[PDB]
Amino acid sequence: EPFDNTTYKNLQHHDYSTYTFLDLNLDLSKFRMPQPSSGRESPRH
């Protein structure tokens, strides 16, 4: 806990992998909110 300014604490990214970013977005899905709807399945509908 004593103030140490001599270490690089952002060392987690040395372990990240190819699918990391999308896996975390999958885990974040439950926390979202109902998206808004235009009223049509697509502009081509």
Add this chain to the structure above:
Amino acid sequence: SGVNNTKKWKMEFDTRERWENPLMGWASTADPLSNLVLTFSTKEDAVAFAEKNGWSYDVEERKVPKPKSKSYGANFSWNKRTRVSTK
């Protein structure tokens, strides 16, 4: 897309026979009024000229482009089909 050749009325005459010259195959005609095209500022002026010269005429009215609604924003509509998929 230019529109400067649509500003004035014209008078033309009916097309008649053109045939191939036996010697060289050129286009031969016996119609003296083949290339006769007259220019007028108004339909009334043209009709008057035809009448005094004793020609039968058919008048076709001017087709003007209709005014339109142009919106660059509609290309990015939120709920409409005007949304473009490519710029």
